[PDB]
Design a binder for these strands. Structure first.
Lengths: 182, 185
DNA sequence: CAGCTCTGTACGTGAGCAGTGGA
DNA sequence: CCACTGCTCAGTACAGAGCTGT
């Protein structure tokens, strides 16, 4: 359905559950603009000006950010997924990331990482909180960073004004990681 | 490609429901007026047009059991009606009229005023003054098919905010069809 | 301004949630 | 697996400019 915007030597990679109906139709990542992504990407200072799904193909070149998902199959709809599917997805994911080895793998929303941990590391995270996670991407110096879902279905994150902090903190981490090249 | 919702249509049909075009969900689900939000299936039941509650899965049984069909003005799928070309509508109504001239349903039901406002301006060349829901004067060219306008079953419409608000016109729809079947003797 | 023709606001639910906190 | 706090998302009357006319 929706294409992977991915390059080599990338700062951040955003990682969704799977492309939404809109996404799939629009042919661009995190459209909406119910999905709070682009507003946050702006507000955070990760983007120079305000952007949108149409600017999505420019992100890695200009702001060093990639895009992808656990499962490429499009649906509503996360409750529409399964399990078998996820496990096979993480497998397909891990590989792609073992190929492009970005600096930071960002998980859009706890759900996706919950699974990913239990499947990639086989660890059931007790009281998971957002931010850097201990373990790295298998056989890679890519760290796992967990962000609250950009999806406009999160009420802990009712506005994009509510969930901007983590993006600021995300930016910082990239910076910190850039420093360690000296 | 998502891509297209099929026409459930037969010969000698009481009602044909006519949407703008198929929504993202509709197109993905492969069934008419899925949701929610669509008050259609609730109303279809609540009105008395269906024996029991139904849903998008039952869409292909409707002509057989309840003599109801389905189609839309424009086939292309989008969000999204504000996403449609003025020219696309014109080509739709043209295509539609045809369909109706072929299947000759008793009544063509128009889901929502917008779709008829255009259809009139394009099939009859008349921009209706202060349009109201219900029966319309003119029949489908070369047919005995009446035109009846319902408020959009969709749920972007605040005049019919609940599904309870839109039930009337389905009751009235039922009556009309019964009247029309009555005269069959 | 009586209508009018035109692009454009702005508006009410019930899902379906992703959270956080409880049975 | 719920109850819940808040968010979204899925056409159509109405607003003003901007007309010709008692």
């Amino acid at each position: 359905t929706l294409p992977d915007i991915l390059t080599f030597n990338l700062d951040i990679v955003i990682i969704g559950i799977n492309p939404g109906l809109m996404a799939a139709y629009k042919g661009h990542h995190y459209p909406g603009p119910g999905n709070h992504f682009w507003k946050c990407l702006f507000m955070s200072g990760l983007s120079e000006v305000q952007l949108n799904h149409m600017d999505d193909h420019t992100l890695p070149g200009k702001y060093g950010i990639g895009f992808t998902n656990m499962v490429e199959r499009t649906t509503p709809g996360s409750k529409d997924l399964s399990s078998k599917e996820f496990r096979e997805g993480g497998r397909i994911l891990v590989q792609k990331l073992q190929k492009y080895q970005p600096r930071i793998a960002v998980f859009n929303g706890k759900c996706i990482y919950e699974i990913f941990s239990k499947e990639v590391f086989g660890v059931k995270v007790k009281n998971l909180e957002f931010g850097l996670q201990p373990h790295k991407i298998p056989d890679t110096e890519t760290l796992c960073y967990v962000m609250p879902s950009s999806s406009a279905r999160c009420a802990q994150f009712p506005r994009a004004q509510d969930k901007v902090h983590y993006y600021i903190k995300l930016k910082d981490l990239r910076d910190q990681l850039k420093g360690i090249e000296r």
